Design a protein around this ligand. Structure first.
Ligand SMILES: Nc1ncnc2c1ncn2[C@@H]1O[C@H](CSCC[C@H](N)C(=O)O)[C@@H](O)[C@H]1O
Lengths: 6, 241
């Protein structure tokens, strides 16, 4: 979750 | 017997295949999604060993005819690892360099942004999001301050552009990490299979874009796990309201 576009 | 093999993103490999039907030879090309910019030369089973920058000038009976660009601009397959972003951090992608540039964002307090160099239509690949390949465990365990540039690639991999590679004076091989967030974006992240970077994501337009228009994408953080940096939480409130 600590990233874009998952 | 010329064969063209397309990726879902619109790039392709083209050439005469060998006895075993593999893209292996000295006259194989990867052609970018503009169907004009190419990397032409030595490939082995579809992997770029030495691709020289070329322009696809015409096709005759399906066979592409290229003109090589001057310079000794050569590229090779160079997939990042957990610790290495690129063998040539300062060597720009030639397709991307014709399409986007980095400048001060029009968004307040957003720093630098990514802008269109020319007018383009919808569904146009504009920029590539390459970076080191690390795990969701590493990313999810650490502070938001270290996670400004992390992009999920798939279930096992996050692509990151960590300091100091977030500065163009240290890394400019790809520029997709420079696109800012918008809840009303003009572009999307999309899967891309790149001959130098391997499987990555790209920035693709949703609609026509004018020259010098800022490219923006929806970062897509979980709003109801919101697990997001503070600037985004702020913007989410404004958007919803
Ligand atoms: N819509 C927005 N509002 C405020 N800051 C933003 C933003 N979109 C991106 N940013 C900023 O950009 C970072 C993501 S990286 C995007 C490129 C960055 N502006 C740069 O100069 O290298 C975030 O940590 C945040 O500081």
């Amino acid at each position: 979750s600590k990233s874009k576009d998952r | 017997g010329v064969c063209w093999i397309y990726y879902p993103d619109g790039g392709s490999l083209v050439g005469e295949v060998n006895e075993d039907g593999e893209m292996t030879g000295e006259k194989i090309a990867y052609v970018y999604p503009d169907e004009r910019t190419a990397l032409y030369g030595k490939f082995i089973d579809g992997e770029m060993i030495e691709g020289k920058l070329a322009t696809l000038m015409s096709t005759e009976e399906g066979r592409p005819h290229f003109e090589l660009m001057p310079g000794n601009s050569v590229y090779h397959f160079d997939k990042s690892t957990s610790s290495c972003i690129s063998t040539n951090a300062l060597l720009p992608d030639p397709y991307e360099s014709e399409r986007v540039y980095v400048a001060e964002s029009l968004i307040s307090s957003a720093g630098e942004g990514l802008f269109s160099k020319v007018a383009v239509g919808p569904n146009t690949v504009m920029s590539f999001y390459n970076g080191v390949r690390i795990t969701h465990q590493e990313v999810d365990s650490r502070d938001w301050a270290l996670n400004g540039n992390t992009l999920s690639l798939d279930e096992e991999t996050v692509i990151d552009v960590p300091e100091p590679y977030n500065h163009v004076s240290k890394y400019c091989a790809s520029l997709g990490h420079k696109a800012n967030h918008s809840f009303t974006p003009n572009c999307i992240y999309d899967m891309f299979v790149h001959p130098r970077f391997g499987p990555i994501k790209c920035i693709r337009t949703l609609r026509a874009v004018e020259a010098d228009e800022e490219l923006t994408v929806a970062f897509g953080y979980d709003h109801s796990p919101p697990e997001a940096p503070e600037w985004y939480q702020v913007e989410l409130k404004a958007f919803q309201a």
